[PDB]
Symmetry: C3
Subunit: 125 residues, 3 copies
């Protein structure tokens, strides 16, 4: 049995997607890019703004799901530019605090909407 996570705070899943799906006690979150739900646009043009927003979006989704950042078992972090890794990293760290989920990281050729960064994750209830 599957349950859709629709936070009113994270970017609205307008297509054939959902922000996340809860199943068998896990929350599977879509790949957040750095949009602001309130604008339907990027929080800003920099890796710094989009990374914060992305991490904020994941938080929103997770929290709507009944999960939390502390319960994220695994992320995949995708970058427009490998050169943005450390800055993204610093922000990712800050967003996760003491919690250190498993992680996969790479640079994509490009990301949806010319996005500089995308983060997905699997978390637990």
């Amino acid at each position: 049995k599957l349950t859709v996570v629709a936070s009113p705070l994270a970017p609205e899943a307008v297509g054939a997607y959902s922000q996340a799906i809860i199943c068998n006690g896990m929350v599977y979150c879509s790949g957040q890019i750095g949009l602001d739900r309130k604008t339907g646009d990027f929080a800003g043009k920099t890796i710094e703004e989009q990374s914060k927003q992305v991490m904020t979006n994941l938080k929103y989704v997770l929290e709507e799901a009944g999960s939390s950042m502390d319960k994220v078992v695994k992320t995949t972090c995708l970058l427009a530019d490998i050169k943005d890794f450390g800055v993204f990293n610093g922000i990712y760290a800050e967003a996760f605090g003491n919690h250190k989920p498993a992680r996969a990281c790479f640079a994509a050729a490009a990301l949806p909407k010319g996005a500089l960064v995308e983060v997905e994750c699997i978390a637990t209830l």
Copy 2:
């Protein structure tokens, strides 16, 4: 307990891979590319054609596993070119209908066999 999913409709797993593995109530499907088991080749040379074939392939694999498109919790959609994003999404949505899995989307530098699109997923039984 891992159970191997081998659908005779989906491209054959001639490798060190299985089409999908079932474990603890969940189906972990490999990244499908647009190969048509019937032609033994890419369904066509077009993003549109490969995409259909990819989604259909996943369908075969899922149903073979005892799952279905409606029970897909999460997909990752990989493109050789980001400009194919909207066209991809349309063909994607048609395939899933009213079901809205979680999703992550990006453009890879390249895909195996020159493939224009690759899609993987996790689903439940």
Copy 3:
């Protein structure tokens, strides 16, 4: 309830990630690169050495988790260069033996630290 996996034989999880996380009967392992913990650097400058070191590293994590390659349900294998596919593949197959996980494959634009190959997986306990 999440268990942090830390093998002293896989590359140290230095920064806001853990080699792997155990949750609800599954082990979600970070994307490994071909670092040799013993040398503090890439096993080698070629795909072959790094791929070997990547598959070694994963064994370590998985084993440390209480898992094993046998128990991997799904891997993601990421190439810096799509043409290392053949060569990598044979290495991967060797490490996994007769076990055939679900799999996804692609070439990233770039990988952490100029790595030529990264492999993540999920496995059962």
